[PDB]
A paper describes a structure:
CC chemokine ligands (CCL) comprise 8-14 kDa chemotactic cytokines (chemokines) involved in diverse immune functions. Extensive structural analyses reveal that most chemokines share a common core structure: an N-terminal extension followed by a 310 helical turn, an anti-parallel three-stranded β-sheet, and an α-helix. CC chemokines also readily dimerize, primarily through the formation of an anti-parallel β-sheet at their N-termini. Certain chemokines, e.g. CCL3, CCL4, and CCL5 form polydisperse, high MW reversible polymers in excess of 600 kDa without the assistance of GAG.
CCL18, also known as pulmonary and activation regulated chemokine (PARC) among other names (e.g., MIP-4, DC-CK1, and AMAC-1), is a primate-specific CC chemokine expressed by macrophages, monocytes, and dendritic cells upon infection or inflammation to attract T cells. We next found diffraction-quality crystals in the presence of citrate ion via a high-throughput sparse matrix method and solved the structure of CCL18 at 2.1Å resolution in space group P21. There are two CCL18 dimers in each asymmetric unit. The overall CCL18 monomer structure consists of an N-terminal segment (aa 1-21) followed by a 310 helical turn (aa 22-24), an anti-parallel three-stranded β-sheet (aa 25-56), and an α-helix (aa 56-69). The two monomers within the CCL18 dimer adopt distinct structures at their N-termini; one has the N-terminal extension (aa 1-6) followed by an α-helix (aa 7-10) and the other has a largely disordered N-terminus (aa 1-7). The N-termini of these two monomers (aa 2-5 in one and aa 8-13 in the other) form a network of hydrogen bonds and van der Waal contacts between their N-termini that bury a substantial surface (~549 Å2). The dimer contacts of CCL18 are distinct from other CCL dimers, which form contacts at their N-terminal region via an anti-parallel β-sheet, exemplified by CCL3. We find that the N-terminus of a CCL18 monomer within CCL18 dimer adopts α-helical conformation, which is distinct from the typical anti-parallel β-sheet shown in the other CCL dimers. Such an interface weakens the interaction between CCL18 monomers, explaining why CCL18 prefers the monomeric state in solution. Examining the contacts between the symmetry-related CCL18 in our CCL18 structure reveals a 630 Å2 buried surface. This permits the formation of a CCL18 oligomer that can be extended at either end in a zigzag manner.
Residue numbers in the entry:
A (entry chain D): 9 to 68
B (entry chain A): 1 to 69
Write the structure that this text describes.
Amino acid sequence: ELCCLVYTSWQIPQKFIVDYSETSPQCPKPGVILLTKRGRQICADPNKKWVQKYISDLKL
Amino acid sequence: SAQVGTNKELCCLVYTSWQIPQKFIVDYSETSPQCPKPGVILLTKRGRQICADPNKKWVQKYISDLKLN
């Protein structure tokens, strides 16, 4: 059910991101949800290199 | 609004089940064109949201009464 419609243009500083979630493949759009230290859940574009770079390291 | 850019924040997934008393609504806003179903977000004075179906007569009436004054 949970999906992204608008992606953030804010390249959230990596150390302000505590985790991320991927959205269902049934969503019309692909999306990852970034969770910030302030507890916001912010949709971001997985086709964006900066988002991909954060995910690659956030896994470590 | 913990959520930013998601359907749950930009769409009406479930309308109010009942007609709201008119005194509560002072404004409204549109939902995303990407939403699977129609919806308008009605706004209370406290800045709080109630999702509603634009196809309802009372919804159109409420909005019209606000705009025409």
